[PDB]
Design an enzyme around this catalytic site. Structure first.
Site, PDB file in Angstrom:
ATOM      1  N   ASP A   1     -31.843 -33.415 -24.040  1.00  0.00           N
ATOM      2  CA  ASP A   1     -30.438 -33.223 -23.685  1.00  0.00           C
ATOM      3  C   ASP A   1     -30.414 -32.272 -22.494  1.00  0.00           C
ATOM      4  O   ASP A   1     -30.182 -31.070 -22.639  1.00  0.00           O
ATOM      5  CB  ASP A   1     -29.622 -32.683 -24.864  1.00  0.00           C
ATOM      6  CG  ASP A   1     -28.164 -32.454 -24.507  1.00  0.00           C
ATOM      7  OD1 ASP A   1     -27.524 -33.390 -23.983  1.00  0.00           O
ATOM      8  OD2 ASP A   1     -27.660 -31.337 -24.748  1.00  0.00           O
TER       9      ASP A   1
ATOM     10  N   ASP B   1     -28.320 -31.900 -20.233  1.00  0.00           N
ATOM     11  CA  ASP B   1     -27.023 -31.395 -19.819  1.00  0.00           C
ATOM     12  C   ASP B   1     -27.003 -29.872 -19.909  1.00  0.00           C
ATOM     13  O   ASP B   1     -27.871 -29.247 -20.526  1.00  0.00           O
ATOM     14  CB  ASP B   1     -25.911 -31.997 -20.678  1.00  0.00           C
ATOM     15  CG  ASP B   1     -25.955 -33.512 -20.710  1.00  0.00           C
ATOM     16  OD1 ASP B   1     -26.758 -34.100 -19.956  1.00  0.00           O
ATOM     17  OD2 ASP B   1     -25.186 -34.114 -21.488  1.00  0.00           O
TER      18      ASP B   1
ATOM     19  N   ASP C   1     -30.136 -27.988 -25.056  1.00  0.00           N
ATOM     20  CA  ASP C   1     -29.452 -26.709 -24.932  1.00  0.00           C
ATOM     21  C   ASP C   1     -28.109 -26.800 -25.640  1.00  0.00           C
ATOM     22  O   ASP C   1     -27.377 -27.777 -25.458  1.00  0.00           O
ATOM     23  CB  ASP C   1     -29.256 -26.332 -23.459  1.00  0.00           C
ATOM     24  CG  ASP C   1     -28.832 -24.887 -23.275  1.00  0.00           C
ATOM     25  OD1 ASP C   1     -28.793 -24.426 -22.114  1.00  0.00           O
ATOM     26  OD2 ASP C   1     -28.548 -24.209 -24.285  1.00  0.00           O
TER      27      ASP C   1
END
Ligand SMILES: O=C(N/N=C/c1ccc(Sc2ncccn2)o1)c1cccc(F)c1
EC number: 3.1.3.48
Length: 253
Positions: free
Chosen positions: A11, A13, A224
């Site tokens: 992930d 992002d 995160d």
């Protein structure tokens, strides 16, 4: 070995794919960097990303019809030579005849990705490659080479024949594919291993992955921020990545 013994879910992002921390200016208040330059590169980088998706990946055509996976509409594709076929002069705008007119676009998107994922200079011809290379270097100097540091862990999992790494993100598929192409994540992220959790959600993509790769493999999530028996590897800090790298070298992961 012969199959995927372990599968890694990334992930990226809040750090790489979606870097909204840049535009809000919080990134510089958090890390003491310059606030105005951070926003400048963010808007400049987003410009080249959406330019690549518009000029090459039919983003205006597929903005409202963004899928969750690339191979989703392969059912309505009658394989044909489309080198002469020009996409601008068709019935597509804004389905057995129009959903037929959607797959070959995504087959074209897959062709552009799988052909220039290591030759971005042949897609966005120089000086555009020279513009983004300077653009990435300026941002990496702020983040202390975060993407370069994160690529060390990605290539490590990629080289393992029993390991593969997949991408789950909240952006639309075509922009995320434009980011992966530009940022140099093309080789370490196979195009069939990218999931845009935009229409459904992050959980519908997790079950989508486990359905494809089976429950006989160990699923690990590295990301995160914020079930299904998948351990999570929160990797926000910079020295955190070193430990994750450190764990991969010793085959603890
Ligand atoms: O590097 C990129 N993102 N890094 C994000 C990030 C968040 C936190 C840290 S760690 C850090 N940062 C600053 C100061 C001290 N420690 O890095 C990057 C994103 C998109 C494209 C691209 F080419 C590069």
């Amino acid at each position: 070995d012969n199959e995927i013994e372990r599968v890694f879910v990334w992930d990226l992002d809040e750090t790489i794919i979606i870097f909204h921390s840049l535009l809000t200016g919080t990134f510089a208040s958090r890390y003491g960097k310059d606030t105005t330059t951070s926003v400048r590169i963010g808007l400049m980088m987003e410009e080249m990303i959406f330019n690549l998706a518009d000029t090459h990946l039919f983003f205006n055509d597929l903005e409202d019809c963004d899928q969750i996976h690339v191979d989703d509409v392969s059912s309505d594709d009658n394989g044909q030579d489309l080198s002469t076929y020009n996409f601008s002069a068709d019935g597509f705008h804004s389905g057995v005849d129009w959903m037929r007119k959607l797959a070959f676009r995504y087959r074209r998107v897959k062709e552009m990705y799988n052909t220039y994922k290591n030759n971005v200079g042949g897609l966005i011809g120089t000086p555009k490659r020279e513009t983004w290379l300077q653009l990435r270097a300026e941002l990496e100097a702020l983040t202390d080479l975060w993407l370069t540091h994160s690529l060390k862990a990605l290539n490590l999992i990629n080289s393992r024949p029993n390991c593969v790494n997949v991408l789950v993100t909240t952006t639309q598929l075509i922009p995320a594919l434009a980011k992966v192409l530009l940022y140099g994540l093309g080789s370490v992220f196979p195009i069939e291993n990218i999931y845009s959790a935009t229409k459904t959600g992050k959980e519908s993509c997790f079950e989508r992955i486990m359905q494809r790769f089976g429950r006989k493999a160990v699923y690990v999530v590295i990301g995160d921020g914020v079930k299904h028996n998948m351990p999570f590897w929160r990797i926000s800090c910079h020295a955190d990545l070193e430990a994750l790298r450190h764990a991969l070298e010793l085959e603890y992961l």
